[PDB]
Scaffold this active site. Structure first.
Site, PDB file in Angstrom:
ATOM      1  N   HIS A 160       0.747  -1.323  -0.055  1.00 55.56           N
ATOM      2  CA  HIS A 160      -0.110   0.056  -0.040  1.00 55.56           C
ATOM      3  C   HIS A 160       0.758   1.201  -0.103  1.00 55.56           C
ATOM      4  O   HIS A 160       0.101   2.282   0.136  1.00 55.56           O
ATOM      5  CB  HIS A 160      -0.938   0.090   1.273  1.00 55.56           C
TER       6      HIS A 160
ATOM      7  N   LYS B 292      -8.132  13.844   5.271  1.00 52.57           N
ATOM      8  CA  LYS B 292      -7.457  12.434   5.179  1.00 52.57           C
ATOM      9  C   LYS B 292      -6.382  12.603   6.498  1.00 52.57           C
ATOM     10  O   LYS B 292      -6.288  13.482   6.903  1.00 52.57           O
ATOM     11  CB  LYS B 292      -6.705  12.490   3.788  1.00 52.57           C
ATOM     12  N   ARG B 293      -5.714  11.354   6.653  1.00 52.22           N
ATOM     13  CA  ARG B 293      -4.601  11.375   7.734  1.00 52.22           C
ATOM     14  C   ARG B 293      -3.646  12.498   7.450  1.00 52.22           C
ATOM     15  O   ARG B 293      -3.044  12.535   6.510  1.00 52.22           O
ATOM     16  CB  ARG B 293      -4.069   9.915   7.785  1.00 52.22           C
TER      17      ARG B 293
ATOM     18  N   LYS C 125       0.917  14.004   2.202  1.00 54.60           N
ATOM     19  CA  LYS C 125      -0.051  14.366   1.582  1.00 54.60           C
ATOM     20  C   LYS C 125      -0.281  15.885   1.322  1.00 54.60           C
ATOM     21  O   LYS C 125      -1.158  16.539   0.650  1.00 54.60           O
ATOM     22  CB  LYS C 125      -1.167  14.043   2.672  1.00 54.60           C
TER      23      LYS C 125
ATOM     24  N   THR D 235      -8.434   6.486  -1.794  1.00 54.06           N
ATOM     25  CA  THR D 235      -9.624   6.201  -1.960  1.00 54.06           C
ATOM     26  C   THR D 235     -10.545   7.179  -1.612  1.00 54.06           C
ATOM     27  O   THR D 235     -11.813   7.212  -2.279  1.00 54.06           O
ATOM     28  CB  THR D 235      -9.881   4.823  -1.235  1.00 54.06           C
TER      29      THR D 235
HETATM   30  C1  LIG Z   1     -11.485   6.840   2.825  1.00 50.29           C
HETATM   31  C2  LIG Z   1     -10.857   7.192   4.180  1.00 50.29           C
HETATM   32  C3  LIG Z   1      -9.531   7.569   4.439  1.00 50.29           C
HETATM   33  C4  LIG Z   1      -8.609   7.292   3.136  1.00 50.29           C
HETATM   34  O1  LIG Z   1      -8.539   8.766   2.535  1.00 50.29           O
HETATM   35  P1  LIG Z   1      -7.368   9.051   1.351  1.00 50.29           P
HETATM   36  O2  LIG Z   1      -7.562  10.695   1.326  1.00 50.29           O
HETATM   37  O3  LIG Z   1      -7.467   8.196   0.218  1.00 50.29           O
HETATM   38  O4  LIG Z   1      -5.975   8.965   2.203  1.00 50.29           O
HETATM   39  C5  LIG Z   1      -9.184   7.913   5.506  1.00 50.29           C
HETATM   40  N1  LIG Z   1      -9.904   8.242   6.490  1.00 50.29           N
HETATM   41  C6  LIG Z   1     -11.316   7.602   6.396  1.00 50.29           C
HETATM   42  C7  LIG Z   1     -11.890   8.023   7.769  1.00 50.29           C
HETATM   43  C8  LIG Z   1     -11.757   7.444   5.257  1.00 50.29           C
HETATM   44  O5  LIG Z   1     -13.181   7.213   5.072  1.00 50.29           O
END
Ligand SMILES: *Cc1c(COP(=O)(O)O)cnc(C)c1O
Ligand SMILES: CC[n+]1c(C)c(C(=O)OC(C)C)c(-c2ccccc2Cl)c(C(=O)O)c1C(=O)O
Ligand SMILES: CC[n+]1c(C)c(C(=O)OC(C)C)c(-c2ccccc2Cl)c(C(=O)O)c1C(=O)O
Ligand SMILES: *Cc1c(COP(=O)(O)O)cnc(C)c1O
Lengths: 829, 829
Positions: B365, B556-557, B562, B664
């Site tokens: 990943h 996102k985290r 990022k 995602t």
């Molecule tokens: C879908 C999801 C992620 C992944 O998001 P990305 O922006 O692809 O890193 C992270 N946290 C939550 C709560 C999600 O729903």
């Protein structure tokens, strides 16, 4: 094609009758011994007869009605051929096509015999031509005035890959369109001295050259209007020339008549470059003096010499006269109009000036400093003593205005002065024009703003109201209906013919982006034109190109600011990538570059040589095959433009942001179904705005990016050190790869690029190549390429000279345009 | 909304009946004293009853039919809430909505009482969740296996602008969805030593921890399939724990039971970062040992212990078992399966290995090196002595293969070895997984190629056939029908409901780009969601945002790769430009950034602090008004994602090219009607390919551009010296502008950006700001913004987890998916 008019049985028999008449009586020939040229001439004459009726009634109409008159003073009139254009605007094309076919003749073969009236270098010269066509079409009492050059822009031949210049002897077998008017011949004075007598000054001891006017008819689009283009021809004085009491011989004195007549002999081939040659200054004064005398005469003849009550005055001169200066070329019209008004008509200086400013208007076409006219004062003092005195008085009073407007601002005075100080004192013609004009326009939005922010900022601060914009246009008649009847045919089938003289209507085509028939037709028409151009190239030059390939074309005068060099870099990039990965599919391309280089412009001729040098390697690499072809089209002129443009897929308009004032060829390409890859420069900006940037291919630096680069300093070495593909090309040039038997051949191009590039070719290389990548991606999908073409054609409406002219009329000239069909059908009874 | 199913009069009375039953008998309450939470629980239980019938018949179905079973081993299962998802997939939403309304209750208020099953950190954890939903929907005999964490991902609170961590006590009032199965409890062994006896080795002297399994139902979309998620819970050994003959006290020994049960206490909060903590290693082995024992038992129970003819064998194990490793987290499954097969089942090493490789498959990943698991061998030797021996033997033989494949290539051996040498010897878990797997996939096309070109190049050269791509997906049920019923409503009105489980069908919407009703609806639905989110923010957090503004959201985290920092630069740019030209119109914007920072990740917490620091200045500038608002959304979790995403206009996906493996959330935004501004990274590339780059907002460096920069060396100072707007921001940060009472507060952010930025934030600043300019231009035109939204939604079909799963099944697992509705209606009779 229905846009070509009717071929009535009667009009056709009448045409054949008159064709045969001319062949016999005018050409003194018979079917048995006539030559193709005899045939073209018989047809041309037959066609010209149709203009006479309207031609005479139009001039009578203006005389009777007495509308304000518009005078387009230009040193250039890039007219191209006239035959087809006359047929189109009178609706005689299909009838003439039928009649000549009945006579066993191919009309198109005959059209090719006609010589281009190539009296222009490029942009502004052709702008003047489109303008004439539009002013007639708009029913304006407009008159074109210029020089009847014996030799227009040299004919370019390519010999051993180099440009060769040949005299353009276009008057060789005569010109069936012009008509000399000896009775309007006038004297133009040169040299001499000035003597300030009792009441006023007098210009005495001058040498005289006569100006004989030749009229050419300018037909509006099917509205029975025929305006006039009056070009002056220089003649030795019948009187004083040989009566100069010279003891050099009778024969020599007669042969010496050549000297004075040399003034209208040849058009100077300088595109965007000022060369202080006296013969040029003579040509400029020549047109101004004669033209103004003619204007004043015409002004006096509305029974204005009959101004008994109140006394004869010139107060109404600006209400009856508009003089538009195409660049600063005819700028002497300012001091000339003042000389006439003060010296000959005895008006007080002040009233004469008010009249002059109200009459004239100047148009700027570039910001490049090397292009602006700065005549040494000694040249002006020797040749036009009185004019230099008047320029000094004009300057004194103008600077007095500036001083009162900005008290204490000395440097502004120095900057705004018409007189340029230095080792060689000169007179800034642009400053003269701004000072003596009531309007000063640019030829594109971005261009008009730069003028107000940079070079004419000081003048803009002194008189904001004076500055305007008049974004260039192109005529839809010559530039669509004439050169692309197939495209005009399909467009007409859907929306009718109203658009030919109301181009905004082309927008209706947006309703067909998803129309399956229209997408097929627009593509078939382009494929037909490409097929046609390929045939012309094989027969006229034995070239041969792949018709099933993308036609990448850049046609315009060869210049460093136009960056044909960038295009060169890209072409070699396409070559090196193919060599790198031979089995990798690439969209086949036929890169066509054309344009003339001014004689003596070393770099420009070296560039033409590189374009053919690249072709010599690329075009003969077996691995390359028919995937890429670099072809230089020689003798680019209006006539070739009408053939290659309608066949173009991609239109190269890659000048450095801020250099190309507007451009008009870019507009021609859009109108004819080609997509544009270009910088945000000139009219490209408005073109992209109109169609939508998503429908365009913009790339590279923007004006502010160029300025930021200049601020820190442009360093080509950086780009060379960071881009390996660029570096590979430069090393190919420098090592002799494109010049085997002359390894050091292009060392001047390399040196300039690396160390003296004022146009930052390297800085736009990466974004340009990537942009081209996008172009090919789109081309890989015919349906989307076409649909995007549709969105461009559909939005080219604003770039019709009809729109431009309508703004000059209403915003500068003070006259209201019209489209009302004049009665004049022809005086048959 | 018709996608919510029927609210039949009978089913509704039955629901109310059962609701009231549970409140009474299960909650031991009455209307007079029940709390909102009692109500949510009564409803949840009522809903869960509907799953039992299908739940039991599904498991019986797999038992009877004996299909190959798919085992998704993951240390994370980011499930979010279950109530609404269960109602949606069973078609009980409208019926339950009606029934609860009749009961005087607001169902949505009750849904908000449910706690997120937040057992994941981000991407791969949520991928596991979507995957479970899709495997059920696809009728696959799939089983999810993981740890039943007592505490999931910490709840984030923002205090004084900083992130504060709180224990996520989600099991506090119980979990009505799980069902413990004590009878399936198993022993997991730790420590001990290995004794190589007569025939084979024996792992002795171990400490035991028991693993008690808790089942959670996974309902397919309306196909009567209910699969299972089996999470292990750690328990102290009933036996030996207190019977360890310890003299520390009876009480202490009992309290000490806590130690062993601490293994399933809390999910490690490390998003994309490896921390070699032993408790973590225990958790990993814990899941593997128990899970594998359960798999083997289930395998043995198809009367395979009854293999009288030929003798009991494990030859058919790979034909009945597929073990998918979500990252290297459960990588010990390789040596564990080998330990069991060789040590306990006495298979010859070679046959055991063939079976192991045929059974397992690993999924990567990320390519960031700090994210990959490298456990010190001393940790592995102490805690899992037998496993380290087996890893060494696996390595020896694998390197023997490499050696025979590439004779003489010593460095390749060193590079490919499972054992990493150095001051601290470690074992590369990724290498272990590649060696013991038959398939190794990436989660996006670009990601899967980089693996083959960079980090696993050597392995790709040794076994090309092994590597694959399985581009991530998202479930259309939770991620559309569940979170955005308005959008699913309008889509259904035009194309029906088939798309919910066949997302490619969304393409049919391309036939409505010019449909006036659809453009209105899609816009009204988005405006409704934005209106809804604004209400949630005002009541739950008393925030208040302008609903008539562009919702710019990045959730996102929090990470450096990022680049939430780039977004920060842009937000301050928007602020400075407004301050510069106050009267200049700008498209109003509400910038929303959210996500959790891993505790101890200094930079990440400093970034969260800057985001709120910027808001403290921006959000209170009167000149700014409601033209710009910077808001940090705290506690970003699956539940918040379902609320904010459907309200988003612009989706920020600006990671440095080459760092984000796939992402995602980017897909979630596309599916819900937001346009994407992002780099050509991860799935962004395929997303742009599917919709068309003209429908996207790509910007900045591409992977090769990053690599070219690395080759010459990234120098942030250059960008700072050449971009004055950037320079102004950096000076604002460094001078204390965004931290008045603490001028030096962000000096670490400044220092990193200027001197230690591994993610080149500056290098993408200019192209990013310009790109945003384009975004706002489009937003200025509602009709075109929407029409482009339509083109994205219409093309999000390929990003449905159904598609992803179908490829794993057919290309990795060897099983054929299905959509055949299982009979199981519920055992009412
Ligand atoms: C879908 C999801 C992620 C992944 O998001 P990305 O922006 O692809 O890193 C992270 N946290 C939550 C709560 C999600 O729903
Ligand atoms: C007296 C009024 N004009 C008129 C009706 C013209 C005319 O009948 O022209 C036709 C033969 C084409 C025309 C004109 C006049 C005298 C000689 C030659 C021409 Cl060409 C002009 C002009 O200046 O050219 C006129 C003008 O105004 O002074
Ligand atoms: C004997 C075959 N199985 C089956 C029919 C099950 C069942 O009826 O489950 C229902 C109560 C939800 C199920 C099962 C078996 C024993 C105790 C608890 C469960 Cl949960 C499982 C499993 O391993 O979980 C099965 C299997 O395969 O071994
Ligand atoms: C239209 C025209 C020009 C001007 O072209 P640009 O590309 O705008 O510089 C020059 N030469 C000819 C023959 C033209 O037709």
């Amino acid at each position: 094609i229905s846009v070509r008019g009717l071929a009535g049985v009667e009009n056709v028999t009448e045409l054949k009758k008159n064709f045969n008449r001319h062949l016999h009586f005018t050409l003194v020939k018979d079917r048995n011994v006539a030559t193709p040229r005899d045939y073209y001439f018989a047809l041309a004459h037959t066609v010209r007869d149709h203009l006479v009726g309207r031609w005479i009634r139009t001039q009578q109409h203006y005389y009777e009605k007495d509308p304000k008159r518009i005078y387009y003073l230009s040193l250039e009139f890039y007219m191209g051929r006239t035959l087809q254009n006359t047929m189109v605007n009178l609706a005689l094309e299909n009838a003439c096509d039928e009649a000549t076919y009945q006579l066993g003749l191919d009309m198109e073969e005959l059209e090719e015999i006609e010589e281009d009236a190539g009296l222009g270098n490029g942009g502004l010269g052709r702008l003047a031509a489109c303008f004439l066509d539009s002013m007639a079409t708009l029913g304006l009492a407009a008159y074109g005035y210029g020089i009847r050059y014996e030799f227009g822009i040299f004919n370019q031949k390519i010999c051993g890959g180099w440009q060769m210049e040949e005299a353009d002897d276009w008057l060789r077998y005569g010109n069936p369109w012009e008509k000399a008017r000896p009775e309007f011949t006038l004297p133009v004075h040169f040299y001499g001295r000035v003597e300030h007598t009792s009441q006023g000054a007098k210009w005495v001891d001058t040498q005289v050259v006569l100006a004989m006017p030749y009229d050419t008819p300018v037909p509006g689009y099917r509205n029975n209007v025929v305006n006039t283009m009056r070009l002056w021809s220089a003649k030795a004085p019948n009187d004083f020339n040989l009566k100069d009491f010279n003891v050099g011989g009778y024969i020599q004195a007669v042969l010496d008549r050549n000297l004075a007549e040399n003034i209208s002999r040849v058009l100077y081939p300088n595109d965007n470059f000022f060369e202080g040659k006296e013969l040029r200054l003579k040509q400029e004064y020549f047109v101004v003096a004669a033209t103004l005398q003619d204007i004043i005469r015409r002004f006096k003849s509305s029974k204005f010499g009959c101004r008994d009550p109140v006394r004869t005055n010139f107060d109404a001169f600006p209400d009856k006269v508009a003089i538009q200066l195409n660049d600063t070329h005819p700028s002497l019209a300012i001091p000339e109009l003042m000389r006439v008004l003060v010296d000959l008509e005895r008006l007080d200086w002040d009233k004469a000036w008010e009249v002059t400013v109200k009459t004239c208007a100047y148009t700027n076409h570039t910001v490049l400093p090397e292009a602006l006219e700065r005549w040494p004062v000694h040249l002006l003092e020797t040749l036009l003593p009185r004019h230099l005195q008047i320029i000094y008085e004009i300057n004194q009073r103008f600077l007095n205005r500036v001083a009162a407007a900005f008290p204490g601002d000395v440097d502004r005075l120095r900057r705004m002065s018409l007189v340029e100080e230095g080792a060689v004192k000169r007179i800034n013609m642009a400053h003269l024009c701004i000072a003596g004009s009531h309007a000063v326009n640019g030829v594109a939005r971005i261009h008009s703003e730069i003028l107000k922010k940079t070079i004419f900022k000081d003048f803009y601060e002194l008189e904001p109201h004076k500055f305007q914009n008049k974004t260039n246009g192109i005529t839809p008649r010559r530039w669509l209906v004439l050169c692309n009847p197939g495209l005009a045919e399909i467009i007409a089938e859907r929306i009718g013919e109203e658009y030919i003289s109301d181009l905004d209507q082309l927008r209706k085509l947006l309703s067909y982006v998803d129309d399956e028939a229209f997408i097929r037709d627009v593509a078939k028409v382009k494929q037909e034109n490409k097929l046609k151009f390929a045939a012309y190239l094989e027969r006229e030059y034995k070239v041969h190109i792949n018709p099933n390939s993308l036609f990448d074309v850049q046609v315009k005068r060869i210049h460093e600011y136009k960056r044909q060099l960038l295009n060169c870099l890209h072409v070699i990039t396409l070559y090196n990538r193919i060599k790198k990965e031979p089995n990798k599919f690439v969209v086949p391309r036929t890169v066509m570059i054309g344009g003339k280089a001014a004689p003596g412009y070393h770099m420009a001729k070296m560039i033409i040589k590189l374009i053919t040098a690249i072709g010599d390697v690329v075009n003969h690499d077996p691995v390359v095959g028919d995937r890429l072809r670099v072809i230089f089209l020689e003798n680019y002129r209006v006539s070739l433009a009408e053939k290659v443009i309608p066949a173009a897929d991609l239109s190269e308009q890659i000048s450095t942001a801020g250099t190309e004032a507007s451009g008009t060829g870019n507009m021609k390409f859009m109108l004819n179904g080609a997509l544009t890859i270009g910088t945000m420069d000139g009219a490209n900006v408005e073109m992209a705005e109109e169609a939508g940037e998503e429908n365009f291919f913009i790339f590279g630096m923007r004006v502010e990016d160029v300025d930021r680069l200049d601020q820190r300093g442009y360093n080509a070495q950086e780009y060379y050190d960071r881009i390996p593909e660029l570096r590979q090309i430069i090393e190919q040039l420098s090592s002799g790869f494109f010049s085997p038997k002359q390894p050091d051949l292009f060392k001047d191009i390399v040196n300039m690029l690396m160390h003296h590039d004022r146009f930052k070719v390297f800085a736009d290389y990466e974004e340009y190549v990537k942009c081209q990548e996008r172009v090919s991606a789109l081309y890989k999908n015919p349906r989307e390429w076409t649909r995007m073409v549709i969105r461009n054609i559909a939005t080219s409406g604003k770039f019709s000279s009809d729109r431009t002219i309508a703004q000059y009329a209403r915003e500068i000239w003070g006259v209201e345009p019209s489209r009302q069909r004049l009665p004049a059908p022809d005086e048959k009874i």
